């Protein structure tokens, strides 16, 4: 607090690398099972990873890590309560785990053991859903639902071997199909509640809480929605956000209407330049020196002019900033005083300049060092800033040395650099800030904050090459909907972090059509005779008479891959196309314009639908194991 | 002003016939001009020819496939030195087309002050007025001076379009200085009555034409920048300047009123031939520009120049009741391909889920305009009915190389029975 | 104090003193129209000595108004029978300045 020690992503000691958190081996094995499930054997492994040695020791490691990230701490009484519920789950699972490992056991015996385990988990689940402590317990809730949903799938697959009749399995399928939805709803209920509450205090606080869920909660929620299949890929592409600066409250309606859009900029483009509006002054000789951050201007595609200033880029107000075809970079004013005795010849300084930092030769910044120092004076608080991006010192404070604030995450790079408007209403231009065809910007006298988004390394190829490259050696590919080649107008950015991506497209055009296109190229050695299938993840809350249509476009060769009836349903649904090969689509190793198109007709006023992600999977590696239509 | 006056003449006496020349080899197409007439009111501003096609024409057209819904004016009045007479200034012009696109910005400037802001509290500042008072016992100069800076708003009428206007400017010399006084009227709405004295009328109107665009030309600044950045879409069509001191009005012919009202092309049974200017598109791809091709007897052509994804323009087509869907039709495409396109140019029908290829044409290099004719088809084949609301015609090509480009001019839809090629163009 | 009514240029120049500078500004929105036009006023107020050579009494008072950390002001000025300033912020109670057997010499 009152020390000048180095910080690490705003914290006082280094943070655990995202790949070394206590839930990481549980996620790693989950991804393996999504691609190939080992019947009547996966609940055991998941049991040994969540409760190693029949001990709750790992689950307490998870609690302590979460408590440190969000600066919330459970009381010693609440801790005694959770551990008691862990041991109850352990005992019942020890009985069941032990019995299936006995070769030649009695199937009807395990049936009763199976049922006892399921009810014991269902019974203790509400203990992790108390609203007063949901900021911490949401991570614990996720592991418990994960253990239960795994038990149901194993039971469904190994039916009679565990003493289940065909009416038993049919009962479990209905139970699974309902609880995979109910568990998602209950988790999202806790996340939106605590996030909305924390943002109203401060956006920095709400981002810090969101950074935790991205690592501990949302990757598993996505996994839940893939467990009914075998052969798809589990991959998260959620970004981590570092907020440096003052406190700015934000309602939840303001987060989704304006703020998130300003942070993302051009969601399918890499950053090539960012600029900063900087102020320095010490004109009253008594008051100490001060600095101000007035605006932030990230530039993505240099040919789009989509993103504008957040804050303001006005360096003066005496006349202009363009005129003669040249931008004004720095205005400096000096003033001099003098008296015979005790000469106050200390010349004051006023500085207003735009600071430019081009993207490096490596296309992306790997890390940064940005910090702000507060200084109190009567009723006023002053500011001093330090900026560094990559190896480029942008700003060294003129008010005094400021300790470092190392912003970095192993396995992540910097994609977006934005800021949040300060001192103005965040209620305007929501319905006008679309993905394209509008000026993504907001005016403000200052921002006094800088926000940095770290994207996972699995996204580096797309933001470098502007296309998705398919290999022969992989079986499944995930395509986040925001990694599009082009999109139609009157479409928005929707925050859907439960999908384990950085967002979804909400279409809302009432003329022509709604369309999103994705660029596909083939690496050499690709087998064009292999059969593939395509899965489309959408949500259709209003009826679409003409439906949704997936199509291949390869120069002159256009082909329909699937046309799907779109009935109204407020949950996420999956559409699977027939099989095809790449030779049918005419796509080769030299093809440079091949696109996948997902499209619908125009909509009515007040209607909308959502695109989340695409799944490309070899026909041999894919199966539907739990029919979703059996509710 | 002088160059527009000369261009207005050619539009009426020269260019309609040049287009006719390029249809004489056929029998069955339609001769129709859609060139606009431009009224320039204000001071003298020189402009090179490279500046006309790189920036100025684009600023005049705004959103080339949209109708105007609002235009705003930045107005200045002052008589602060009591000796010098009153003066007025036009500082900026902001035409708004699609209210959801934010494509067009100020030409000139919309800054009414510089003491602080113009937004902040979610409300735009409309008028700043400053008064000042003096006094002396004998010969009291109690005449209070006035300084006025305000934004003037004129919404598009209930008839969707203004039919005429009355705008004029009065010059007054004073030592080495020339002063200005302005009068503005649009339709039946008096926007500005001059505070310097009565100004005679200047009736702007052409029988058979209506007002589509209201723009202006930047004054006192270089017109050399942002040419390669001012595309049809995906960029901010604007230019900063201390004043404009001019207003430019474009009158479009009445044969264009249906498209700018309905946003679609309606086909009738009783007609034989239809012309579709390329700028009357439903949507267009990025990195495409406005090209002045007045010899085509239209208001311009699309120059495609995208080096990724694809180059595509789409056109909206609806059917009036009584249309015979069993009639056979053909489609003619007027393009210019100065560089080779290996994968060619492709015409396609898109009607909800029903997409069909109407023609795929070899694109060899040739610096003259060429015509591509598709095979015959019927509208029943394309699945299009009287209730269809999303049917589109797509003309597309692949991505291009750096420095390459091709041009789209117009489309011709003609009944197969009414059309013949009478002079083979391949016999050179 | 200071008699500067502005800082855009001058106060003399053409042989005449500048008495009042008033600035108005106008805003507008379709719904809940904030058409309340703001006002900025800077003026020099003159009060000549009466025909009786001296003012006998006066009525001058100031009203304080608190707002967050800020205190605002409103003034009322009267000399003799001449109302110099009536407050634009609201009514301010009188403050009778007078002493029997005394007159006003200095202000």
Author numbering:
A (entry chain A): 13 to 643
B (entry chain A): 216 to 643
C (entry chain A): 323 to 429
Q: What did the published study say regarding this structure?
A:
Cry11Aa and Cry11Ba are the two most potent toxins produced by mosquitocidal Bacillus thuringiensis subsp. israelensis and jegathesan, respectively. Cyt1Aa, Cry11Aa, and co-crystallized Cry4Aa and Cry4Ba. These are produced during sporulation and are remarkably stable in a variety of conditions, but dissolve after ingestion under the high alkaline pH levels characteristic of the larval mosquito midgut. Solubilized protoxins are activated by insect gut proteases enabling binding to gut cell membranes, subsequent oligomerization, and ultimately gut cell lysis leading to larval death. Cry11Aa and Cry11Ba structures maintain the three-domain organization characteristic of Cry δ-endotoxins.
Cry11Aa crystallizes as hexagonal plates and Cry11Ba crystallizes as larger bipyramidal crystals. We opted to derivatize our Cry11Aa nanocrystals with a recently-introduced phasing-agent, a caged-terbium compound, Tb-Xo416,17. The phases obtained from single-wavelength anomalous dispersion (SAD) were sufficient to reveal the Cry11Aa protoxin structure at 2.6 Å resolution and subsequently enable phasing of the Cry11Ba protoxin structure at 2.4 Å resolution by molecular replacement. Two Tb-Xo4 molecules were identified bound to the single Cry11Aa molecule in the asymmetric unit (isomorphous peaks at 23 and 9 σ, and anomalous peaks at 33 and 8.1 σ, respectively). Regardless, phases were of sufficient quality to reveal all Cry11Aa residues from N13 to the C-terminal K643. The in vivo crystallization pathway can be best trailed from Cry11Aa crystals, which feature a single monomer per asymmetric unit and build on six packing interfaces burying a cumulated surface area (BSA) of 3515 Å2, corresponding to 13.1 % of the total protein surface area. Perpendicular to this axis, another two-fold symmetry axis relates dimer A-B to dimer C-D creating A-C and B-D interfaces. Crystals grow by packing such tetramers in a brick-wall fashion via face-to-back contacts between domains I (interface #2). Using Tb-Xo4, a caged terbium compound, we could phase the Bti Cry11Aa structure by SAD, from ~77,000 diffraction patterns collected on crystals consisting of ~75,000 unit cells on average – an achievement to compare to the determination of the Ls BinAB structure from >370,000 patterns (native and three derivatives) collected on crystals with ~100,000 unit cell.
